[PDB]
Amino acid sequence: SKDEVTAELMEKAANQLFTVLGELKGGAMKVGQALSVMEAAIPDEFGEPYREALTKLQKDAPPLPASKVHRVLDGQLGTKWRERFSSFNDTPVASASIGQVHKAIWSDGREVAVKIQYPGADEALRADLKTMQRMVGVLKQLSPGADVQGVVDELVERTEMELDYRLEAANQRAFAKAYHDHPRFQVPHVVASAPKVVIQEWIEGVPMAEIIRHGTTEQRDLIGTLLAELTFDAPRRLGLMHGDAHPGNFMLLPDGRMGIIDFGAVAPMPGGFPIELGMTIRLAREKNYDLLLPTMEKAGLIQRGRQVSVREIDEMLRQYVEPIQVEVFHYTRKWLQKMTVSQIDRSVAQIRTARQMDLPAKLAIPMRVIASVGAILCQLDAHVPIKALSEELIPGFAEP
C-alpha cells in the first residue's frame, strides 16, 4: 500500500523533529557530533556487554515457544504454577510491549488474560538504560550548555515501569476497586501479579481502534462520551487520572460499558482536577478578560509580568472553549486541524508567547492527558455532551 508508507514516513518525520528538539533544548549539540564525543569518551570495553544483552532478547523472537512461556511462569509463580490454573492456552492471543498475552482459565473458573514478559527483556532494557545513563553523563560533562536535568530519573522510571508488572498492577487495583459495579466503566480485577507475569480478568468487547475505523455513529458517540467522562471522573473519584490515553486501552462492551484494560500511564492527582482550569475555561468563554488574565497568571497558565495579547489568549484556549459552547460537540479531525492553525501571523507582529512553557505539574499532567483524549475523540468522530460533563465533573466550570 501507499498508506503504510505514508504512516511510516510520518512516524519518521515526528522522530526527526523530536531529535531536533532534543538537540536544541537538551543536548546542546547535533546528535551526530554528540555521538562522536560519546564514542570517544565511552570505553570500547562497554560495547560487547551491551551487545550481548540485546542479543538475548533477539533470540526466540515473538511469539515465544510454549516451553519458554512455561519457563517464565516457573520463574514467577513457581514450577507448580499449573495448579493455579484450571487450564492454560499455550498459543498467545496478543502481543504486549515486551511480552505476550495468553488466554487461560483460573483455578476458580474465571477466564483470565496472562501477560508474560519476554525472558531477555530485563537484561536488554537495563543494559540500554545503563548506556543512556553513560551518554547523559557525557553530555553533562562535555556538551557546553547541555540541559539534562531530570533525564536519568525519567529513564530509570520508564524502564522500571516497563520491567516490573507489579507497578501497573497496583494502579489497576486502585481503579478496579473504584469502579467495581459502575454502570458505565468496567475495570478487570488483578488476579495475580509478579515482576514478569501479570494476570487479570478476561473481558470481551469491541476495541476502540475498531470503532475508530468502522464504528457506527452510536458506537463512536458512546465510547467517546465514556472516555470523556472517565477523564474527569477518575481524579474526582479516586485522585488519579487514567493518564496518557491510547485506543488500545479501551473497548466497548455489549452492555454499553467501556472496558479499560491498561493502566501503565496512571497519573497522580490527589487534590483532584485543579479548579483553575475549569474556571479559566468559563471566564474565557464569557470573554471576561479583566478576570481571566489575573486568574491565568495566578494559576501559572501564562507567564508572569508580561504584556500579553488577548488574541493569543483566545487562540490558546479555543480548543477547550469551542466544545463547551454547544450542548453536544462534534469532535472531528477537521475541527482539530482548524485548531492547529495560528491566528497571529508572525510577519504581522513579533510577540513572545504568553504561553507557559514551564507549567506547574498539577496543571501539566491533566492538560497532557486531555490533549491525548481530545485527539482520540476527533479520531472517533464522536458527538459528546462535553458541556454537561464539564458542568457536573470539572471544578470551577459551572456557573456559580
Numbering used by the authors: 43 to 442
The authors write:
MABP-1 adopts an unusual three-dimensional fold with a kinase-like domain and a linked accessory domain. MABP-1 is a homodimer with each subunit containing a bilobal kinase domain and an accessory domain. The accessory domain is indispensable for its function where it participates in dimerization of MABP-1 and in erythromycin binding.
The accessory domain consists of six α-helices: α1–α4 helices (residues 1–120) and α6–α7 helices (residues 161–206). Crucially, the α1 and α2 helices in each subunit insert into the accessory domain of its adjoining subunit, resulting in an N-terminal domain-swapped dimer. The accessible surface area that is buried upon dimerization is extensive, at 2021 Å2 per subunit.
